[PDB]
Amino acid sequence: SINDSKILSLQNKKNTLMDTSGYNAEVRVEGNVQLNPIFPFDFKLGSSGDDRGKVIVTQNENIVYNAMYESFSISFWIRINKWVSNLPGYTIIDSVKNNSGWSIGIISNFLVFTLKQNENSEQDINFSYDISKNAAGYNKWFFVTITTNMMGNMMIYINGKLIDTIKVKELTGINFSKTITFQMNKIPNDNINMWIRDFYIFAKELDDKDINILFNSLQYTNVVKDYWGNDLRYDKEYYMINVNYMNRYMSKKGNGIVFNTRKNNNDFNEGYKIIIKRIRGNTNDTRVRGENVLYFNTTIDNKQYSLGMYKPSRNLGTDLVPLGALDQPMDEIRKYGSFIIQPCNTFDYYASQLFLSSNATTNRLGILSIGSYSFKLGDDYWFNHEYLIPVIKIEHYASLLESTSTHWVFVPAS
């Protein structure tokens, strides 16, 4: 068991932040700190005002270091909202006293872990997110794991994946602080939020295997997630986007759903939104789960449509049926507009695949994909036009299973 070396476990428990490691650290909460009453029972901090949130963790000075020798690991879930690539410097989790200990900060697109021996000697390691893949900010939940061996390496992991490895050379030992401070403090030289859950410290150096077991065990992998990593829900407006076409939003021409190039990457708030509706599932609690049967509603010009197949003006390709927006009764939705969802998460995104349902059952008929095709929609008459459309590949779609063009994301409209 890896829990044997766990010396701190900061968790929200019955609307109270506490250490559940058995080592009974003092947890003091000040200012504007919000606790989530539902999963993942996170706590929320801001950079706003003089009365911003502050969580002080004071560890028992003795008992926690009996098992520690040369190595320690820090793990936690974190989400930062409007993590812009030009973000000013912030210290977010501080554990430095008298120029000794460790600190976690954010600057630009970097999450930086600093290890301080004294005022003259320190080393840092970092994760820098891919700006091109996150033009609207890195605003999703991610899992951080930092391992340190004083006679070996500092290592940083994001979502179970090893990001960087730096040899500890300068430092020859650390006098750790009693205190860990969760607070958003601007470095002395627009407003940001931070969510944390399950902050753990281990008295050993966790390996790749341990980190992944940990990473997965803190998740409900059967629950589909939205773009930011929160639980995907029914009866909620989302912007539906294809992973391969992030600069595209949803529009309508005639029967067809068409994809247009978005204005900018300030946010995702452009074009029409979908609402996910449940038909079938094992649990009934508003959350979208793997193997659920569902359909999609959308409001366009004071009318509500459902997504469904339609016959295109001319053939698009073998086994290809276009998906459009139709004003149809439930019988037609079940026959031609029902989908089976299956989550597929990667390091880069929280996404899902959608399979065409056979009469609103869990039997599969095709996979929902995307492509550009030349045909006629709306009032097109004289000429065929190229349209980027959602398309279902029916019967034969084995080579599309591993294709990212079948990965769909949902950004909350809010």
């Binding site: 197949m309 339609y310 016959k311 295109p312 001319r314 053939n315 049926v321 031609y336 056979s358 009469n359 039997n363 008929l365 029916i394 019967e395």
Partner: peptide, 16 residues
């Protein structure tokens, strides 16, 4: 059957 559902989809959504 599945073969029936594919035949139905071909008849309804393909030209022709």
């Amino acid at each position: 059957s599945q073969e029936d559902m594919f035949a139905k989809l071909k008849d309804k959504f393909f030209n022709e």
